[PDB]
Structure 1
Amino acid sequence: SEKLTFKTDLEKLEREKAAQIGVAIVDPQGEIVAGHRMAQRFAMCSTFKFPLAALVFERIDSGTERGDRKLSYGPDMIVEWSPATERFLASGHMTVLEAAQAAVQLSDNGATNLLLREIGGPAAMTQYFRKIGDSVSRLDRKEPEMNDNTPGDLRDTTTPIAMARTVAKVLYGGALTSTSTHTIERWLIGNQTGDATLRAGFPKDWVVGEKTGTCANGGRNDIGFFKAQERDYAVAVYTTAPKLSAVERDELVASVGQVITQLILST
């Protein structure tokens, strides 16, 4: 079966790369298409920034936040990998929309913390997950501590199936207005950090958008959506490979993308 090939090929990567690979693919209604270690806990790291943007747009939709609100900050806001936040520092602020775009498309960590402060912190992020029917995903810390990925630590974790269903809810399940949905989808497509990961394993003609993550202890993740053969899918991929190089971890995620492609095209 196509399903057996999918399992076998993922386990081949696990064995040869000494990795753990979590995968969930669901349809727009959140029904399972395929999975691997789908109920296993993995650190979200930067993948959570996609849900964070959804939270922000939900508040914009509800009129309790404005995209043009200026969020002021100083040097203390700058953390490792804050390319946009550093550029805007002299000006003294980034708007909500600028910060959200930087968080999603550049994985800017300063901008992420700036937004977290504005919307109510990890508590607010976790409440949002709960609100959209995700009882699993949880944010406990901010950048950079949330990326520690200490084995067995439940902080700042999700499971592939929980996250994939969250992506589906946000993009296909009416969590946001069509306008806000479209804005986030286009940001995901135009993301600048995912060229070497999941989408490098998908066919050139698929419409795909995604958000990457990188965790200590060899974490490399990618979540998002793709349209293939006129059907829409939500996908979450979490990997851990402590002994691989950074480039090899990119290649691993792209390889998982190729395995996903083979399954999807066989159906």
Structure 2
Amino acid sequence: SEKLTFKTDLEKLEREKAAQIGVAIVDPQGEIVAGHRMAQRFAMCSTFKFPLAALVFERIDSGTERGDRKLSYGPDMIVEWSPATERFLASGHMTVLEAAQAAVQLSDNGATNLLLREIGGPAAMTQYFRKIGDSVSRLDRKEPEMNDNTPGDLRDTTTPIAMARTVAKVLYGGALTSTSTHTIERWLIGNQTGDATLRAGFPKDWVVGEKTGTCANGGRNDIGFFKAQERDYAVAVYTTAPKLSAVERDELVASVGQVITQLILSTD
């Protein structure tokens, strides 16, 4: 009902924009609220940096990593779009927390690779997904190649449903201590890269936090959480729109925001 509209409206976007749209919305326990191609595989792009941050916190939680440990690097660690890494380059390090926060709030690629160097690489990222009960999401490469988004390639993908549930796990499911959870949640709320995407599509009174992703070949994604009408939701949106402009891809994810708002409001 609400459901059929949700679906209809996405299918219209898909048609008119020549795009594929993958969406999952779940409650804090991971129960499905609404989805579209929810188990189609989509490249993660930078959306993985959020789970990367959760993995880091889990290791801080358990005493196997320290938030203020200094990670030294040189210019070899700078990749495309590494705004904070470049700033700290001369100082010669960024802490574990500095790097995680820049990865999350700026999508800093060098900071992401610095973290991956410390935690055991893509294999370790993937292991963590498995640890939090996600058996679908997979990191196979580092930045920037993990964003190649080669048509058909299953490397470095997830499904809206698995990622939605993973988000719910970290935010509501007890994967992190109450202190880590709160911190990573504030980080998503204060994300600097999501202004023109999902949150542009949600009402202004919802508490929204999220992490965007951009891949080659028309990938544009946004995952996070929102609290509407005192209910908590985890959401994952992955889109593929090869012939749209970057701006229009932003606008497409925003439009998806709207369709989701309509569903949630109509839902009881």
Q: Deviations over 1:139-159 (max 9, x none)?
A: 000000000000111100000
Distance 1:95 1:222 in 2: 26
Distance 1:199 1:97 in 2: 25
Distance 2:57 2:38 in 1: 28
Q: Deviations over 1:49-83 (max 9, x none)?
A: 00000000000000000000000000000000000
Q: Deviations over 1:205-238 (max 9, x none)?
A: 0000000000000000000000000000000000
Q: Deviations over 1:113-160 (max 9, x none)?
A: 000001110000000000110000000000000000001111000000
Distance 1:33 1:195 in 2: 24
Q: TM-score, normalised by structure 2?
A: 0.99
Q: TM-score, normalised by structure 1?
A: 1.00
Distance 1:251 1:26 in 2: 23
Q: Deviations over 1:150-188 (max 9, x none)?
A: 011110000000000000011000000000000000000
The alignment yields a C-alpha RMSD, in angstroms, of 0.3
Identity of aligned residues (%): 100
| SS of match in other structure, 2:217 | helix
Distance 2:91 2:99 in 1: 14
Residue in 1 aligned with 2:68?
68
Residue in 2 aligned with 1:115?
115
Distance 2:179 2:135 in 1: 26
Q: Deviations over 1:92-112 (max 9, x none)?
A: 000000000000000000000
Unmatched runs of 5 consecutive residues or more in structure 2: none
Question: Aligned pairs, how many?
Answer: 267
| SS of match in other structure, 1:239 | strand
Unmatched runs of 5 consecutive residues or more in structure 1: none
Runs of 4+ in 1 over 6 A off after TM superposition: none
For residues 92-241 of structure 1, the aligned pairs below 5 Å read 92-241=92-241
Residue in 1 aligned with 2:44?
44
| SS of match in other structure, 1:217 | coil
